[PDB]
Amino acid sequence: AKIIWTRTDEAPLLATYSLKPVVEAFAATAGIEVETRDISLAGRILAQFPERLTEDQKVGNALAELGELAKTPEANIIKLPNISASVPQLKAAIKELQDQGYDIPELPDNATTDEEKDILARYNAVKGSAVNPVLREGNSDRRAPIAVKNFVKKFPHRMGEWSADSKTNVATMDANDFRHNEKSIILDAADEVQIKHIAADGTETILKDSLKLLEGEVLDGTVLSAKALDAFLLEQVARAKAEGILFSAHLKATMMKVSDPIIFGHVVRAYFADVFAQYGEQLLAAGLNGENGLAAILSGLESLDNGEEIKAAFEKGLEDGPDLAMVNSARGITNLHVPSDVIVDASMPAMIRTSGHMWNKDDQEQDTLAIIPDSSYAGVYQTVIEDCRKNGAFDPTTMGTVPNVGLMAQKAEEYGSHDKTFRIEADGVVQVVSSNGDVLIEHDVEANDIWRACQVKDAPIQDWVKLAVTRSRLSGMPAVFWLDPERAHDRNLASLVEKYLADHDTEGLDIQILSPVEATQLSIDRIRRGEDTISVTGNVLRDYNTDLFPILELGTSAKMLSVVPLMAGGGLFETGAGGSAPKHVQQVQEENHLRWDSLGEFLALAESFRHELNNNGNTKAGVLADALDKATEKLLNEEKSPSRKVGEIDNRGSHFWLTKFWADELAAQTEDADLAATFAPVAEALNTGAADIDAALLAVQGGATDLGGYYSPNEEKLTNIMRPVAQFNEIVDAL
């Protein structure tokens, strides 16, 4: 078997030149090959334009080959953070490669010829998030890492004290929202369907011409009522004001790129009711509607020149309304200024952790009314708030843990809905119409309503159920499916979960189905008494739970095990969800200190070894994984993760100590005597040499360093820089 280690960009790229040769040496003792594949920005650019290159310059299409790999049981891929290119990064990479002799074309800035149109289309496929959709052929298994959990117990993060008198609450709609208006069906056979609007006129408008659906696919349609939404919002503005608490609003403007900016605008106009009552027609005509935040409105006013008295009215709105949760007090930035500033899955746990407070204009903590307009998920957070009010803050030294198994494959549910979401222009109805003419789903709609459809396919659902059973069996933790009886979609999924659970041996396992509110309550009841509960959920709750529980248990959601069990039986082990840390590279250029933390790599690696153990029968991989868990725990115990500061332990040093501790554990274990004899002299060499090797890895730091490039660094220079101590290299390369 083979483990593919992704060669990416910037900081993780540099770490990989140090860490991968060690991983390769240790892995080979379990009969496992470790190879890199090049999915760097520069490499993916070269892959896209082979026709311009000499044979020696060519890269082969590594992303496409990894995509194919992922559809086979052979796949075992360790994926590190990589660049999702902005246009500037793309232009910089292109220029760098041209300077190095690769005759690739310029990014056209105004394609007119057919060749230019083709080149632009090819580059546009390379920019942005190009990699994740090719590699994620699966659902999600995310867990707080045990090595990090055990350290938190030793050294807990701060948890704000809660008051029984707290007035913080979530406010959410009671009716006429996506949850209550949702209708859902399961297709009997494949069908290409149409989405249509029929106005009170009779005038038909096709909203989406063709939508191919599979046999067994689950289809939902639903509407958020603009009128109910507006009525609701105006009431919450008044409530925050009467109760003397912060008005706050929590959406996902970035991911839900069609619905949530619209909803946001409704929020802004509610807060500034009097302003829109007097200048509404004019502002809306000029596109100053709040869907790009209050800051866009304010900026646009200078073009209007009755804008001065409008500016004055907004300023008056801010003095007269409830106090707003602040994004940046020093710049005067409120919750309403930029739609993407406050993002629900981050903001809600941060507020819960901070005694249920957000920050006011004086930069002091204050209770908040947290507005989450649609009611599908609001109750999870409300249930946690009420529990903290009654029982006080969670105690990270004793609390249990709540992993997540999440239905994600093929852009499941709301995260595939953006091309099926429509701002309604006129009163009437919207129909999903079958090819045969049948009307499958129908909703009444009014102008300014939001209509949305969502799809999840049957194989992803079956895979999701298998993964829930597998996680419960392997971990011993009970599993709870979070499905809301009041949602049509969740009622359909519940019937399928019941059907498919019968394909599995569940004897000895505790698996049940509860509403999201019931499930949250059970989970937190268990967590407080030190016990564990796996949350089995759809796509959005995946996104929410994988922030909420880690932030409470660990102080952060940035340090997680994230696995995507691939459809054909392989695995993808994602080391990290952040970017590739350009400032980290700057520091190495300036003073040869790499502060990049490889913890996520050590953790994903241990799970990669477990995949070989569990799916491919590799007993030695299991031994390697057990030792690696203990080595990681020791590295954290001695705080040997990289310092930020020059002259102190860096990324290369952390790799050394991790390798020393992992070898020690392999030499000390008695589960595989042959592995023990292999690593006894390795451990002895690293121990005797540790004082000298550690001093040397400190000594290389301090001065300017030449990588030979940035997007396309020189391989000889990177090797010498990232593997600078011959004494260590000799031990690794001999094993």
Can you give the binding site for Mg ion, defined by CB under 5 A?
Answer: 345, 543, 547
Residue-wise over 96-107: b if at least 16 C-beta within 10 A, else e?
A: bbeeeebebbeb
CB of 363 to ligand NAP, least distance (A): 22
133 binds ligand NAP, rule: CB under 6 A? no
Binding letters toward ligand NAP, positions 377-416, x by CB under 6 A:
----------------------------------------
Residues 554-593 that bind ligand NAP (CB under 6 A): 576, 578-579, 581, 583-584
547 binds, among ligand NAP, Mg ion, none (CB under 5 to 8 A by kind): Mg ion
**Closer Cβ to ligand NAP, 133 or 578, answer by number:** 578
Size of the site for ligand NAP (CB under 6 A): 9
583 binds, among Mg ion, ligand NAP, none (CB under 5 to 8 A by kind): ligand NAP
CB of 703 to ligand NAP, least distance (A): 20
Whether 378 and 372 have beta carbons less than 8 Å apart is answered as yes
596 binds, among Mg ion, ligand NAP, none (CB under 5 to 8 A by kind): ligand NAP
Q: Which of 681, 708, 693 is nearest to 657 (CA)?
A: 693
Residues 595-624 that bind ligand NAP (CB under 6 A): 595-597
Q: Which of 388, 348, 341 is nearest to 528 (CA)?
A: 388
Other CB atoms within 10 Å distance of the CB of residue 270? 24
543 binds, among ligand NAP, Mg ion, none (CB under 5 to 8 A by kind): Mg ion
For residue 595, say whether it is annotated as part of any ligand binding site: yes
Residues 12-41 that bind ligand NAP (CB under 6 A): none
Q: And the tokens for 643?
A: 């310092």
Sign of CA dihedral 545, 550, 555, 559: negative
CB of 134 to ligand NAP, least distance (A): 19
For residue 415, say whether it is annotated as part of any ligand binding site: yes
For residue 597, say whether it is annotated as part of any ligand binding site: yes
Whether 703 and 591 have beta carbons less than 8 Å apart is answered as yes
**Closer Cβ to ligand NAP, 597 or 664, answer by number:** 597
Phi/psi at 198 (5° precision): -115, 115
The residue nearest ligand NAP at its CB is 579
Inter-CA distances, 680 with 23, 125, 289, 730, 734, Å: 17, 50, 69, 16, 13
Q: Which of 132, 211, 152 is nearest to 550 (CA)?
A: 152
**Closer Cβ to Mg ion, 532 or 547, answer by number:** 547
433 binds ligand NAP, rule: CB under 6 A? no
Amino acid identity, residue 563? V
List all residues 6 or more positions away from 220 whose beta carbon is below 8 Å from its beta carbon: 182, 183, 184, 413, 453, 454, 455, 488, 489
Distance (Å, whole) CA 465 – CA 497: 7
Distance (Å, whole) CA 416 – CA 104: 34
DSSP 251: B
CB of 532 to Mg ion, least distance (A): 20
For residue 141, say whether it is annotated as part of any ligand binding site: no
For residue 142, say whether it is annotated as part of any ligand binding site: yes
Chain breaks after residues in the chain, where C lies over 2.5 Å from next N: none
**Closer Cβ to ligand NAP, 656 or 679, answer by number:** 656
Q: Which of 20, 33, 22 is nearest to 682 (CA)?
A: 22
CB of 463 to Mg ion, least distance (A): 21
**Closer Cβ to ligand NAP, 449 or 597, answer by number:** 597
**Closer Cβ to ligand NAP, 481 or 711, answer by number:** 711
595 binds, among ligand NAP, Mg ion, none (CB under 5 to 8 A by kind): ligand NAP
CB of 81 to ligand NAP, least distance (A): 7
DSSP 106: P
Residue-wise over 349-376: b if at least 16 C-beta within 10 A, else e?
A: bebbbebbbbbbeeeebbbbbbbbbbbb
State the DSSP string of 686-704: HHHHHHHHHHHHHHT-SS-
345 binds, among Mg ion, ligand NAP, none (CB under 5 to 8 A by kind): Mg ion
CB of 557 to Mg ion, least distance (A): 7
Q: Which of 154, 143, 142, 6 is nearest to 70 (CA)?
A: 6
- Tell me how many helices (H) and strands (E) the chain has: 26, 24
**Closer Cβ to ligand NAP, 9 or 387, answer by number:** 9
CB of 573 to ligand NAP, least distance (A): 15
Q: What is the Rg, in whole angstroms, of the alpha carbon atoms belonging to the chain?
A: 28
CB of 658 to ligand NAP, least distance (A): 15
599-616 and 619-637 helices cross at what angle (nearest 10)? 160
For residue 579, say whether it is annotated as part of any ligand binding site: yes
581 binds, among ligand NAP, Mg ion, none (CB under 5 to 8 A by kind): ligand NAP
- Pairing label, strands 326-328, 333-334: antiparallel
485 binds ligand NAP, rule: CB under 6 A? no
10 binds, among ligand NAP, Mg ion, none (CB under 5 to 8 A by kind): none
CB of 399 to ligand NAP, least distance (A): 26
Q: And the tokens for 257?
A: 């790129």
CB of 560 to Mg ion, least distance (A): 10
CB of 85 to ligand NAP, least distance (A): 11
Task: Specify the DSSP element, H or E, that contains 143.
Answer: strand 140-143
List all residues 6 or more positions away from 91 whose beta carbon is below 8 Å from its beta carbon: 107
For residue 542, say whether it is annotated as part of any ligand binding site: yes
**Closer Cβ to ligand NAP, 414 or 597, answer by number:** 597
CB of 697 to Mg ion, least distance (A): 36
For residue 709, say whether it is annotated as part of any ligand binding site: no
Q: Which of 666, 401, 377 is nearest to 551 (CA)?
A: 401
490 binds, among Mg ion, ligand NAP, none (CB under 5 to 8 A by kind): none
Distance (Å, whole) CA 483 – CA 497: 10
**Closer Cβ to Mg ion, 367 or 543, answer by number:** 543
For residue 436, say whether it is annotated as part of any ligand binding site: no
**Closer Cβ to Mg ion, 214 or 255, answer by number:** 255
579 binds, among Mg ion, ligand NAP, none (CB under 5 to 8 A by kind): ligand NAP
| Sequence ranges of the binding site | 82, 84, 129, 132, 136, 142, 252, 345, 415, 542-543, 547, 579, 584, 595, 597, 644
| Sequence ranges of the binding site for Mg(2+) | 345, 543, 547
| Sequence ranges of the binding site for D-threo-isocitrate | 129, 132, 136, 142, 252, 415, 542
Residues that bind ligand NAP (CB under 6 A): 576, 578-579, 581, 583-584, 595-597
| Sequence ranges of the binding site for NADP(+) | 82, 84, 132, 579, 584, 595, 597, 644
